[PDB]
Amino acid sequence: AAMEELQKSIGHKPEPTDEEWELIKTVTEAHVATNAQGSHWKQKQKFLPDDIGQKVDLEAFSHFTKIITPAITRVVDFAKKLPMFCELPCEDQIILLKGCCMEIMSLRAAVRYDPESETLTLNGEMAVTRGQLKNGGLGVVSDAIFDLGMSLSSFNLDDTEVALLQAVLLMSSDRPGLACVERIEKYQDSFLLAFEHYINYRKHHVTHFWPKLLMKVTDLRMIGACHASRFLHMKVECPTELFPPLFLEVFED
Ligand SMILES: O=C(O)Cc1cc(I)c(Oc2ccc(O)c(I)c2)c(I)c1
Ligand SMILES: [As]
Ligand SMILES: [As]
């Protein structure tokens, strides 16, 4: 219990326990496996026509929702590759995924922010600008993600960190309706821990790194909630036909 609480008070910044490494291995695997087209510096993006997205620019909105079912599936793939997840009742596995889906999606899109072209890359293919994503039906949610991506520039995260982060967003035991609420906090904490340890081991040269990286979990949660509201404004504004099936089931909450 306090082998940590004490080891801390001393000043020791504990690396990950042999077992935690196994857990980190699992999560970094599952992430990279359910990821985009790879992930590197210098060319790949398919810059979205500049005349797209400039109410709701239905032209853009289409492009997005077009490649939205793939993204939503990779999130479910990731969650599938985490044993702890599988250990949960199908009911809960659905409440969890529907909750953290946009959160993990905003994260992935945010960590693909290119400061040069000032664009994110959705599904690792389509590049979009702030106003393109904004006018394509996300509104102020675009500024949220773009502002995040810019901020995450400095944390210079890696797959494992972005992989763990997603696991923390996933085991949010506060989702309404959860049945096995305890067994979920146990797993999230298990993660937050292997996560904190991994950050010590990596030792970034940023003061208060961890406290700052947890403040991101909150911002991601806020992008999530803000999206739910934007989904309403989208239902009413855009048609009822341009809404992929999966996309729809996942977001009626
Ligand atoms: O990049 C990835 O893998 C994940 C990802 C994929 C997409 I498409 C995306 O844009 C959205 C999401 C919801 C929505 O209602 C609309 I309109 C656009 C974002 I932000 C992130
Ligand atoms: As909002
Ligand atoms: As906001």
UniProtKB/Swiss-Prot annotation:
Effect of residue 147 to R: Stabilizes homodimer
Gene Ontology annotations for the cellular component aspect, listed alphabetically: chromatin; nuclear body; nucleoplasm; nucleus; RNA polymerase II transcription regulator complex
Claim: Glycoprotein is one of the keywords in the record: no
Residues annotated to bind 3,3',5-triiodo-L-thyronine: 74, 123
Domain NR LBD: 19-253
Main location: nucleus
Entry's transmembrane regions: none
Outcome after substituting residue 36 to T: In GRTHD; impairs hormone binding and ligand-dependent conformational changes
Gene Ontology BP, a term: female courtship behavior
Keywords assigned by UniProt, alphabetized: Deafness, Disease variant, DNA-binding, Metal-binding, Nucleus, Receptor, Transcription, Transcription regulation, Zinc, Zinc-finger
GO MF entries: chromatin DNA binding; DNA binding; DNA-binding transcription factor activity; DNA-binding transcription factor activity, RNA polymerase II-specific; enzyme binding; nuclear receptor activity; RNA polymerase II cis-regulatory region sequence-specific DNA binding; sequence-specific double-stranded DNA binding
Record note on what altering residue 108 to H does: In PRTH; impairs hormone binding
Binding site for 3,3',5-triiodo-L-thyronine 1: 227
Family: Belongs to the nuclear hormone receptor family. NR1 subfamily.
Domain statement: Composed of three domains: a modulating N-terminal domain, a DNA-binding domain and a C-terminal ligand-binding domain.
Free-text function comment from the UniProt entry: Nuclear hormone receptor that can act as a repressor or activator of transcription. High affinity receptor for thyroid hormones, including triiodothyronine and thyroxine.
UniProt disease link: Thyroid hormone resistance, generalized, autosomal dominant: An autosomal dominant disease characterized by high levels of circulating thyroid hormones (T3-T4), goiter, abnormal mental functions, increased susceptibility to infections, abnormal growth and bone maturation, tachycardia and deafness. Affected individuals may also have attention deficit-hyperactivity disorders (ADHD) and language difficulties. Patients have normal or slightly elevated thyroid stimulating hormone (TSH).
Subunit-structure text: Binds DNA as a dimer; homodimer and heterodimer with RXRA. Interacts with the coactivators NCOA1/SRC1, NCOA2/GRIP1, NCOA7 and MED1/TRAP220 in a ligand-inducible manner. Interacts with the corepressor NCOR1 in absence of ligand. Interacts with C1D. Interacts with NR2F6; the interaction impairs the binding of the THRB homodimer and THRB:RXRB heterodimer to T3 response elements. Interacts with PRMT2 and THRSP. Interacts with TACC1; this interaction is decreased in the presence of thyroid hormone T3.
Protein name stated in the entry: Thyroid hormone receptor beta
Source organism per UniProt: Homo sapiens
